[PDB]
């Protein structure tokens, strides 16, 4: 792949429909750990061992402790230069009749906070619940989400489980339902929303430039989106602190923190 910023910017000048795919690396500079770097451990586990319906089936208190911790940490976090460059790019191009869409694997909502409008949150949101009984999806920013979680979620190895009885975890308040809530987050082994996937496929099929930013490109189906676009002959530029298994499929690779490279690229 080319590291020519000038060649990328020639495509960027002409592009009518840009898809920006992001992962946890785009939020690293807001002081939010990635999943596979740092930093990624919560007590003894990584996200892949907790973000699963089997963890939730057999220890919903532990899974809730993890998501609670993340919710409370994320409340104080701010968009960084990469999130702003992405939002500002969308705004500026929109006034020219040019489309920019963000397809994010992040559930942190920082793209929303940055000012991105055309946002596809393909793994859900830290700040939404879904009821395991009635299926209702609700926005939830309550701190703490339920009283039993107050002061819980401490991330240090050696921290004891809160072991909250299931009745005292977050419960559904729709129509007296009372059902156990889960995070409205896509877990390993679970299907992404088919309606979201249909929107993604239409953006990928019609875009004429693609950036893939801060993702390890190992989680599917997301990891195949930018390669799909590249394989149509459309230029794809990867922005990452390192190379990934997808790097060689792409037209461009810009190594470095995306809070530096994205403002330059999208200027």
């Amino acid at each position: 792949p080319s590291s020519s910023m000038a060649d990328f910017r020639k495509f960027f000048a002409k592009a009518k429909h840009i898809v920006i795919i992001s992962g946890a690396g785009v939020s690293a500079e807001s002081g939010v750990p990635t999943f596979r770097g740092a930093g990624g451990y919560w007590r003894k586990w990584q996200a892949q061992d907790l973000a699963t319906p089997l963890a939730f089936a057999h220890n919903p208190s532990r899974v809730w402790e993890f998501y609670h911790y993340r919710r409370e940490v994320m409340g104080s976090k701010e968009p960084n230069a990469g999130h702003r460059a992405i939002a500002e790019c969308e705004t500026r191009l929109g006034k020219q009749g040019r489309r920019v869409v963000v397809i994010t694997q992040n559930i942190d909502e920082l793209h929303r906070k940055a000012g991105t409008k055309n946002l596809l949150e393909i793994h859900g949101s830290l700040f939404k619940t879904r009821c395991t009984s009635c299926g209702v999806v609700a926005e939830n920013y309550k701190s703490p989400i339920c009283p039993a979680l107050s002061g819980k979620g401490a991330p240090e190895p050696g921290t004891q489980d809160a072991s909250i009885p299931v009745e005292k975890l977050p419960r559904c308040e729709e129509a007296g339902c009372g059902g156990l809530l889960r995070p409205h987050v896509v877990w390993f082994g679970e299907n992404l929303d088919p309606a979201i996937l249909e929107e993604v496929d239409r953006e990928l099929a019609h875009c004429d430039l693609c950036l893939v930013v801060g993702t390890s490109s190992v989680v599917y189906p997301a990891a195949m989106f930018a390669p799909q676009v590249a394989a149509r002959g459309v230029p794809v530029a990867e922005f990452n602190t390192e190379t990934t298994p997808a790097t060689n499929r792409f037209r461009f690779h810009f190594q470095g923190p995306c809070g530096t490279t994205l403002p330059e690229a999208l200027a």
Binding site: E190, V218, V219, Y220, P221
Partner: peptide, 7 residues
């Protein structure tokens, strides 16, 4: 294809 996996 629609399942979150690694992949």
């Amino acid at each position: 294809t629609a399942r979150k996996s690694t992949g």
